[PDB]
Symmetry: D2
Subunit: 115 residues, 4 copies
């Protein structure tokens, strides 16, 4: 039943990325980003329960991982200010989305699983 | 479960289903001998390859048959396969996840070790 | 070279450079908005050179945006992301040279920074 | 530009080229064994050129092995993998030029092939 999940891994430690701050924004008709949902990754590196099928309507979404604070907490000065993932959701029926991310200090990878 | 494999498809945005996986263990003599095998489920995951007791200290080679995967989908891929080779259980007993992200001419792999 | 900001892009589906990828660069203002800084497209090599100089490329927060959506749709492929952007602080301990490398798939991308003195 | 097999490696932890990565190339035989074909180390650019020539780079199954374990150990880091290898058939349908690109982290790597006629 979870329509939008986030999963984050740490490529330096070979572990889930724990305590990663996540902010979701939804684009408005006027074109601005308004706050939609927020949370933190658990011990699993996964974030559940951001939203529900009812609230997760058609629109353009931006998922922002606070990668800078993550690396700095571990004593590492990273390259990026954050990692944004921007996408259109539910444009042709309701789907379930997973945004996965793999983090290094100077690099990240992100994949979408859509079902 | 001490050794899990998880595979994603970057072209379709989905689990990579029915990926054949072969695992080998290096012998004292230096050759690869078969150790375990299976296929990824609809989840893109493969569980139950081995047990904590059977998964002894050694050098392991996990081979994903990426070529068969892409050819089944009507795509001619670059690699013959994707091998992931590593020492396991040399410093305390651990659980490993080998994750893989596949495109026709590219792949990424990560280890989660707990 | 004297080139302080380069972009290199590869296509993971075709096994080739990503050609004619549109790139927009922005610089964060005092008020907290993005103003246009530079723009170009990747060449046959998948690379974009000559975006800026060390005179113009001063200390600040920059945003580099690849139009990944238009790139895939030109090839007949419907991609996941609206775009791929990279946001970073530049030149805050003196001038450096930066390369933003990116690897593209329809539902996935990776980006790496190479920073040199 | 005449170079038929190139290797390019980046370090995702340092944000730099991966320098002095040991590279070994093998070619498969009729009997199914790996015979040595070429070897070298990445330069300060992270690139390795001059491994072979078009005349020597004949049709066959090749194995390119990056010694990632030694690389990380030299930097004081205990890495996950024994190495990173890329196995592929080359020059089966026309003679081509190949670039094997890799991005390294201690517990992760990505590899991409760029093929050009």
């Amino acid at each position: 039943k979870c329509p939008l999940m986030v999963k984050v891994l740490d490529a330096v430690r070979g572990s889930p990325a724990v305590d990663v701050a996540v902010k979701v924004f939804k684009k408005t008709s006027e074109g601005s980003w308004e706050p939609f949902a927020s949370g933190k990754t658990a011990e699993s590196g996964e974030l559940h329960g951001l939203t529900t099928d009812e609230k997760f309507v058609e629109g353009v979404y931006r998922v922002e991982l606070d990668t800078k604070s993550y690396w700095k907490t571990l004593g590492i000065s990273p390259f990026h200010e954050f990692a944004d993932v921007v996408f259109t959701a539910n444009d042709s029926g309701h789907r379930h989305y997973t945004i996965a991310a793999l983090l290094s200090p100077y690099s990240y990878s992100t994949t979408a699983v859509v079902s």
